[PDB]
Amino acid sequence: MAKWVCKICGYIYDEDAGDPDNGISPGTKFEELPDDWVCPICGAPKSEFEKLED
């Protein structure tokens, strides 16, 4: 699945990993994260993530 970078801190949202500590099971697509999900490291909004693909 896809990976997304937090353009603030460099955290990688890996869709394969999810973010279980913050309520997100492995395999959750970035688009499906709640609108108010934030980077677990720096707190940046979803707007601050870049999909890692051309």
Which of 9, 20, 32, 50: binder of Fe ion (CB under 5 A)? 9
Residues 14-53: x where in contact with Fe ion by CB under 5 A, - otherwise, as a string: -------------------------x-xx-x---------
Which of 8, 14, 17, 46: binder of Fe ion (CB under 5 A)? 8
Which residue from 17, 35, 41, 37 is spatially nearest to 27, judged by alpha carbons?
17
11 interacts with Fe ion by CB under 5 A: yes
Which residue from 19, 40, 22, 41 is spatially nearest to 30, judged by alpha carbons?
19
CA triplet 46, 41, 2: central angle to 5 degrees?
50
